[PDB]
Amino acid sequence: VRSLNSIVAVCQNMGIGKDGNLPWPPLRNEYKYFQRMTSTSHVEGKQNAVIMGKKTWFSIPEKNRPLKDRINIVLSRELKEAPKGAHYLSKSLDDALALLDSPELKSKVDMVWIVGGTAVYKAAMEKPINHRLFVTRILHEFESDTFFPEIDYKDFKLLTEYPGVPADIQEEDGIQYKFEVYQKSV
Numbered sequence: 001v002r003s004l005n006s007i008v009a010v011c012q013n014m015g016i017g018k019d020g021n022l023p024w025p026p027l028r029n030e031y032k033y034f035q036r037m038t039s040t041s042h043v044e045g046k047q048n049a050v051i052m053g054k055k056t057w058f059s060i061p062e063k064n065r066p067l068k069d070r071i072n073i074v075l076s077r078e079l080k081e082a083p084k085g086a087h088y089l090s091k092s093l094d095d096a097l098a099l100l101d102s103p104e105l106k107s108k109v110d111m112v113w114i115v116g117g118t119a120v121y122k123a124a125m126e127k128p129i130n131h132r133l134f135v136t137r138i139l140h141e142f143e144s145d146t147f148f149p150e151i152d153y154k155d156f157k158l159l160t161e162y163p164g165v166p167a168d169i170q171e172e173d174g175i176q177y178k179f180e181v182y183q184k185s186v
């Protein structure tokens with residue numbers, strides 16, 4: 001494909017989860033940011049595709065699957081068939097990428113978003129393709145048992161500005177956070 005997009009929220013230690021869920025209680029504004037960023041396509045009659053690992057898919061409340069208005073792709077070396085609600089099942093990132101390039105998908109899909117977990121992010125990170133990483137840095141220490149892979153500061157350059165991403169420190173429910181965008185160019 002042309003380029004990937006990755007979106008994650010991280011607390012101070014780069015933690016992204018705890019016990020199968022997020023490390024922090026719900027932040028409204030963070031949420032809407034995710035829905036908005038992942039769902040919004042810049043082309044009529046096109047839909048965005050989201051890619052995620054098995055543990056992440058299941059983390060989503062059942063009645064809430066699949067993420068409305070996007071093509072849900074789950075990665076798993078173990079599942080035989082796509083979990084109930086997913087659109088496609090794939091064995092590796094590569095398979096996922098290939099599926100996307102296929103005739104039927106080729107045309108129905110706008111942007112591709114990697115929504116985790118660790119291994120998905122990592123895999124996407126290493127592909128020598130154009131890639132933009134949308135990070136929400138939550139300026140607090142919540143205990144996490146899952147972490148964001150290490151990012152290559154030589155490859156991913158932090159943008160100083162980007163359209164429609166507030167640049168100031170935000171706050172909600174007594175917690176502050178900041179939005180950051182890194183860009184990898186091949």
Ligand SMILES: NC(=O)c1ccc[n+]([C@@H]2O[C@H](COP(=O)([O-])OP(=O)(O)OC[C@H]3O[C@@H](n4cnc5c(N)ncnc54)[C@H](OP(=O)(O)O)[C@@H]3O)[C@@H](O)[C@H]2O)c1
Pocket residue numbers: 007008009010015016017018019020021022052053054055056057059075076077078079090091092093115116117118119120123146
């Ligand atoms: N903060 C955030 O932005 C954010 C975003 C997502 C998730 N989360 C949290 O992270 C946790 C889930 O993440 P996780 O890292 O533990 O799990 P995960 O990546 O969601 O699930 C991992 C599984 O998915 C399959 N998989 C993963 N990478 C794959 C690859 N490259 N090729 C094929 N299959 C692959 C494998 O399943 P098989 O064993 O079946 O092969 C692997 O066991 C939860 O706590 C969730 O709340 C946070």
Ligand SMILES: [Ca+2]
Pocket residue numbers: 078
């Ligand atoms: Ca397994």
